[PDB]
Ligand binder design. Sequence first.
Ligand SMILES: [Mg+2]
Ligand SMILES: [Mg+2]
Ligand SMILES: [Mg+2]
Ligand SMILES: [Mg+2]
Lengths: 379, 378, 379, 378
Amino acid sequence: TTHEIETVERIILAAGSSAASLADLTTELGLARIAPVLIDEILFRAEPAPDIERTEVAVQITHRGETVDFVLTLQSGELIKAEQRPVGDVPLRIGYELTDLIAELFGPGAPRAVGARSTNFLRTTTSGSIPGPSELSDGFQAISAVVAGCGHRRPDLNLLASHYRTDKWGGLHWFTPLYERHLGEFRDRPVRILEIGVGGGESLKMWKRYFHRGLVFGMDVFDKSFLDQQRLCTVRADQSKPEELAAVDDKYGPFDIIIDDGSHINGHVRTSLETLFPRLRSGGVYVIEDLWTTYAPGFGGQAQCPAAPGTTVSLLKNLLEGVQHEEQPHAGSYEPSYLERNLVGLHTYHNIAFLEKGVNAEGGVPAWVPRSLDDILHL
Amino acid sequence: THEIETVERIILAAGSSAASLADLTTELGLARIAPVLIDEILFRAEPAPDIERTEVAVQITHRGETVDFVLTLQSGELIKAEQRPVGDVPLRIGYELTDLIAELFGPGAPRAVGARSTNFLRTTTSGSIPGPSELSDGFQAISAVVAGCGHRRPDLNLLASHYRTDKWGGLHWFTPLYERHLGEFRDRPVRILEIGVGGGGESLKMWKRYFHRGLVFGMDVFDKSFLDQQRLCTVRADQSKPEELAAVDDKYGPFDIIIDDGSHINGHVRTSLETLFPRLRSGGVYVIEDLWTTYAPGFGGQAQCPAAPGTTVSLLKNLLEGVQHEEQPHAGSYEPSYLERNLVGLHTYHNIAFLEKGVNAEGGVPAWVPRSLDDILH
Amino acid sequence: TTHEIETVERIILAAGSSAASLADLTTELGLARIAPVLIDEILFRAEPAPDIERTEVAVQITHRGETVDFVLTLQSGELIKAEQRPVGDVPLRIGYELTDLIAELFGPGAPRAVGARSTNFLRTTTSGSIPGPSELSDGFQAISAVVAGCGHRRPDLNLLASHYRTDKWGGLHWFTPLYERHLGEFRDRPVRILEIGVGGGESLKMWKRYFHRGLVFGMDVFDKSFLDQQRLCTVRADQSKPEELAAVDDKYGPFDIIIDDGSHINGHVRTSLETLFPRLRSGGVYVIEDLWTTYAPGFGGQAQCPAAPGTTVSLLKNLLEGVQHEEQPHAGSYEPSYLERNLVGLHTYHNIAFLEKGVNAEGGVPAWVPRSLDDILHL
Amino acid sequence: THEIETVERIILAAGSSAASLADLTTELGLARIAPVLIDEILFRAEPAPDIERTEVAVQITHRGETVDFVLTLQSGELIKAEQRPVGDVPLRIGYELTDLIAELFGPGAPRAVGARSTNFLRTTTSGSIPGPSELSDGFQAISAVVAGCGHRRPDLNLLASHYRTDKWGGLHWFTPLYERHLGEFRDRPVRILEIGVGGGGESLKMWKRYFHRGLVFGMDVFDKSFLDQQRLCTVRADQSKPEELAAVDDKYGPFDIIIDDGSHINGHVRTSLETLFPRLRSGGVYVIEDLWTTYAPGFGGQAQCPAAPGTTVSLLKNLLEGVQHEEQPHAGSYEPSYLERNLVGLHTYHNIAFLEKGVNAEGGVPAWVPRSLDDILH
Ligand SMILES: [Mg+2]
Ligand SMILES: [Mg+2]
Ligand SMILES: [Mg+2]
Ligand SMILES: [Mg+2]
């Protein structure tokens, strides 16, 4: 279904393009093809359903004469369902123009405060007039949850990590705020993200939610195809085999972001960086979680300090010195390595490192700048 | 009203110099400040996630003094806290007093890292590996308490649904219009007055949670003192009596923000604006919800269109013309009314109007600007 | 040259799209076609040149084996020039990958802090070693001005209005901060903007600078084709003739933004809104400057107060009441007018009004809500 | 040092309660506060646009007292101001004292509208229509002065080029890295120390303009008191003498931000960090510019790679390993060094390193987490 992941990509790109480009896409695919992709997105982002009794909420999408109706069913502790049925008597209604809802789910930039949709709230009550205290309270909560799933309002990544139950926040690690600092500027971008290391898929769900325009790719040596869903593809590949990493990029890249949360075997960490850093988009970010295995013999680490050559912390110390390559003394001719030339910033926190890729060539300090505090006070 | 002033001082110090925050912590001491910080964490960490009774420790240290609290989180129960030893509690959070004051009551971007210490299950009941439940419940518990320890931007739409106010999710779709016009004040030490508590107080709790540095005032003719809590005061007064409005501003103001969600009686709406707009902070905002009563005879409205003089929509039309007062023809002798002079922006949406106060005096179009082809030809 | 304005539009849309879409565009057009469009943008945004003596700054762009060199000449009070020449001995150099510079000029989202470009600063001095105090100071300022013209760092619209010398700020009007409040959320969007009312073109230059991804359209009844340049097209049309307004939208729309700063003849103001409001993109903004003519008989206004029917302020009072259409009593059946149905917000300041377009259908207050303060205290 | 404390009080009041700002304006009075506000407007409106001698009036009123200033703008000349009558000056700006204090020294989104009054050429010298020059020069003059009256975000890259500092535009490309790591402090009442004034002071003026609410301290072994101005103090001290560093922090600190742009002598860089990092605000930032001297023997560096122990790059490598201190093998008896315990983030770019201070104590990976297939099999 690599024709089905290209259709979502096309809807996502048109959502941040010209009116003409969005008009040409909605013409070609039609309402009947696009609507179910939008309904899938609403179910995924409106979860979890509030603590309420089975309540129906209607969603209608219109585009150039055509209109399609869906009814969503919300109930405490249950998966939100949708069926293509008439709105009929359902007293909780949301209406969208197709172009508005595509921009509301997949558009970049500030969410719209007002005028993106129509709404009908209990204009008729099963009560007859003033609704039951239950019907009214459950009604507010139901239609609010669906509207929340219809947009791209900024989510709190700390809560998403607790909600999807990933170890990225709340005990073993405190990463998600640093992910907001370094990946936040890409939330609006149509990104392709690769997480090495997927039982599992929690963190993949979190990235699908955070990057509302993203395609999420989960790489593991074991099959995880049962996690596959819209904008979330799992791939089988070994991070210790350069040819399998290349095949992953050849098929699903290039990636704006690559996160190594895999085996944490020092060798694997080093191979994934050497192979994938060159394939990462310039201006993109490479992340390595779980630095601690640097010191664990069972992960190809050494239990010494300073960290032993060929361990993740030793690597981070060499990358750090690599950023200053232009200022280093070089006997005769020298060309900078790929990592010296393309790593413009290294962010080191407890148990995690962020590698900014970019052109690292500002030129070293000119020869005409004094190389002693002598010649300064002598001028 | 001596307990309101102590919180206000902790809030202001949180946004001041290191010297000013050092002076305050020295004067009041940890013992007096700590319970105020614990009260906020309980208020903002709510609600407990769907888990079994789990204990989380919060330790607060200042200049050699340390005080420990243990919080109890359980599915569907109010979060509790007791000043207890933390020795046997394997989920712990550690804060310096100046850090926890800024985290709760500081303006400025939430700190991503290094604000606190944390001990997560370094020891387990089993003593070799924690159960699937113990670990999962642990993550949720310490996550909920940590979210309560800071001022990370909340989604005002979700706050309205959580606090079960009618400001979002059916009758009204206001909260993003509030984010648009009040958002720039989230970091400010605001005093906000909401006229009409309506049982009730939902929107007061919403504003308390949104304005992490704010003092919230709920004004109603009926007693609502059963809602009173830290940073939330209810005042008994009538929005139809200018002297009772003035007494509210004389005691609890001035207000940065004033919202009219009261009786919606056209006369009351007009009296409240005439009395309180002149007392509102310059650069502050005055809001009128539920404009529809303009058309309801039972609210002192007229069921006609255009809206009848003395109804809220007619008032908003005259305010709109008032902003152009310098361009209107009149005698030089003309002096602008308080509203003509002090209303610089009027924002009209469905059933809500936002009034920006400021100096409306840029000068009318100079007399040397042509007014016809009569003047262009010369 | 409506094939030349479509080429810029294509470069702008690809700048905020997928890697594949940007790769396909740079392949089709090639470096030789794209580079001059990027050089034109750099000259336009690097102005004004600093108060310095004739200094040369080199800019090189590379894409898949091909590389093109340009040398820009900056001098106090003179137009910045560019020639396609070799960098040769020029000691002030900036290098870009084509894809980076397209995203840097036309990309949406946070400017890149680091790694977007290469630079060589006076590695050789005409001096021989430590440069002349003039050469060094002039060098800093020259290469800084060109780098500033190579990005999309947020400009201060108040300064742009003073720089291009438009009456939108600094005496007669104080508009530009309110334009930032209402149009700021579109700066990153590939917008088509129409200003009715163009001697002149100052404000058009300002919009081209502010919307770094925008196409600017200046409508006037007189010819202004001498102002035409990249992303800035002038059109001849009368704002009192609905058929000429339609022709403008048919050819160059739809517009995200429409500003009426024209004749200020009340009739013209009313005709432009009635015709163009329906053609404006939903979620878009319609602006009317110079409300004062409401009261000037020479502009079809009346010198009375309240303002006379058929004058701009009277219109703004009816639009304001129009937003509450659902709450108004309607004898028998009624359908809301286009303006009641599609105006979700009205912003009225001194001498200017902002009209937000959107779906205005939340439903009026349900019949089951009490219509007396009687039935409330009786429940 | 009594003049620094008066500005600090006006800055803090600007970000406090209406009551606190009312107390301060009452105590000091308009006569004492006004010249401080005029000094800022001259500093921030600079430079005058390319125009002929044009006069702009600024009137400041408080509780019935009003004081008028006339500013003179001319192409290539320092902007002047005199407390003069404004009767004959047709370009005028009017401000209430509380508004002009917030506009200059307030945190929070620049006010779009209603902060001030303005009179623009309601009367002309000609008395029927102003010349092309008179009008054009007027727009520019009153525009320049209005830009100086507020705190609208400046482009730190343009500030560096305007103030002619080497932090941007050739030798270094630092300023966007400063926007990234210091930007969240623009609104805060910071005390920033820049070690090394280098004639000089350009970067001090840049920081003064950027941190509109900040007090800027320039530390150098040579006298630089000729640069001293409002919100800008130069201190004589040696970054190689821990007792002289401590005296700087004891007199003018604590500092939110400390930048090392001094001698670049490896030993001095190490001594400055060892002494001042412990005194830096928690949640504050320590910056080291010009890492290249790591490799220069004339700076106490070694011309080898990897960098030699006791050189700046070796220090940064050890700090990086220091952040993982909890995961390193050692005896339980191990106690973390000040830098291991208090360095929570290290940001390395070309020739510059940013050190985040905070509590680095989240706990190392629990002992119950498997360390091999040896443990996975059980
Ligand atoms: Mg992990
Ligand atoms: Mg209500
Ligand atoms: Mg005009
Ligand atoms: Mg330097």
